[PDB]
Amino acid sequence: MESLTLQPIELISGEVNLPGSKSVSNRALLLAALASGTTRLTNLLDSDDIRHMLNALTKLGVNYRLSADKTTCEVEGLGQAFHTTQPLELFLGNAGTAMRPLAAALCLGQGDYVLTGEPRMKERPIGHLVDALRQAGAQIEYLEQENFPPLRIQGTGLQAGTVTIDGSISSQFLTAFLMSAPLAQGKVTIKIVGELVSKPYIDITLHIMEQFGVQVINHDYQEFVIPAGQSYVSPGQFLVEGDASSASYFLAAAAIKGGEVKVTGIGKNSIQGDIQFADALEKMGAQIEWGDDYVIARRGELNAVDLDFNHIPDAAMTIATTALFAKGTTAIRNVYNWRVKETDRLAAMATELRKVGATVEEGEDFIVITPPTKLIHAAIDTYDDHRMAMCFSLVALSDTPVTINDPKCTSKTFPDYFDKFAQLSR
Ligand SMILES: O=C(O)C1=C[C@@H](OP(=O)(O)O)[C@@H](O)[C@H](O)C1
Ligand SMILES: O=C(O)C[NH2+]CP(=O)(O)O
Ligand SMILES: [Cl-]
Ligand SMILES: [Cl-]
Ligand SMILES: [Cl-]
Ligand SMILES: [Cl-]
Ligand SMILES: [Mg+2]
Ligand SMILES: [Mg+2]
Ligand SMILES: [Mg+2]
Secondary structure (H helix, E strand, C coil), X not given: CCEXXXXXXXXXXXXXXXXXXXXXXXXXXXXXXXXXXXXEEECCCCCHXXXXXXHHHHHCCCXXXXXXXXXXXXXXXXXXXXXXXXXXXXXCCCXXXXXXXXXXXXXXXXXXEEEECCHHHHHCCCHHXXXXXXXXXXXXXXXXXXXXXXXXXXXXXXXXXXXXXXCCCCCHHHXXXXXXXXXXXXXXEEEECCCCCCHHHHHHHXXXXXXXXXXXXXXXXXXXXXXXXXXXXXXXXXXXXXCHHHHHHHHHHXXXXXXXXXXXXXXCCCCCHHHHHHHHHHHHCCXXXXXXXXXXXXXXXXXCCEEECCCCHHHXXXXXXXXXXXXXXXXXXXXXXHHHCCCCHHHHHHHHHHHXXXXXXXXXXXXEEECCCCCCCCEECCCCCHHHHHHHHHHHXXXXXXXXXXXXHHHHCXXXXXXXXXXXXX
16 A cells, blocks of 8 residues: 655646546547548547557557657557457456447457456446347347446447437446447437436537547437448547546646646637536636636635536536535535446545545435535545545645545546646645
């Protein structure tokens, strides 16, 4: 076990050039592999989740070149589904954006695969996706527990026709099926049976699919039609947006202890839903300036809010620790799927927030946070969850230190987090 103790930080100010978006990166890499032509990606994220995708693509026979700095990557598209001739084991860490999309895509071609990862990934649901894939003819075996990885998949092709996807636990099941659908044997219709959470991530998927030359008919997020005969064609150059979830910590830091912070790589017209974290901060009293390729947060005040955060579940965690600095009791609602992510985040957040002095109601799908007058120095457990480390770093914006256990867990999406935070810490 390792730990990092951050002494109290008296002022936050500066600028951060954001790491690339994890969500965008993994979608673009998979579509680049399937597409015709070479995709020239820039601002790609270097993090564990991307590394696992890259490693899978290597095993799957994709030729690519990654720059020394790991942000520039040229991917030679296969122009078809994967075709492999020896059984492969794909270790996918705890990367949902690799596991879910690859579970679908590997059904399209020819080969034999075991999709696995870290212990926690074996405890994250995938049954809703498998059920839909099987409707379209897939051959998928649960190797351990029913409805969970690890999976054994044999390539079969996916049939034309109508399938049903439950959207209530993860949007990633729909994302995964959408991405594979153009390579099915004909027109695909996806009917949603179990209302959709994390809706903005579907918007990301559709947007990037269009960049790669594929049209999808979205009938009010309840039915999606993917017309027949389409193929992915590389857009050529592809710029990955900066990560809006990663930005949340620095915008919040300014809201708490600024000063002002400018983050670059996201702006008013970015596709990522998590830019909407800035709208929530603004409701708390931060001053927000929107640019085209930047967002600025400036200290104003911090008042508690009571909002539905289903649209921004990842950045919503940042509100939980920001709430420690707000006037009044904050409620973060409609975030059930916190429970099925890197850890059970509702349980973890409740435990750790109480350790720094907050009083907390942990609801089934919500959390209510009453800040302490005086923050307590605690050794925060991070649960193999990058965001627990990043959210709790903000505690040091008080007059009190915070100790972060296993600080390297930030590597899932943001290996250089602490250095960027330090840059701002005056
Ligand atoms: O599709 C995506 O890129 C993501 C979807 C979200 O998952 P859910 O749809 O399960 O909320 C989010 O938590 C994850 O970090 C990224
Ligand atoms: O990044 C996050 O906060 C949640 N990730 C879930 P995954 O991307 O592993 O499905
Ligand atoms: Cl920087
Ligand atoms: Cl309590
Ligand atoms: Cl409780
Ligand atoms: Cl402690
Ligand atoms: Mg289990
Ligand atoms: Mg109809
Ligand atoms: Mg205990």
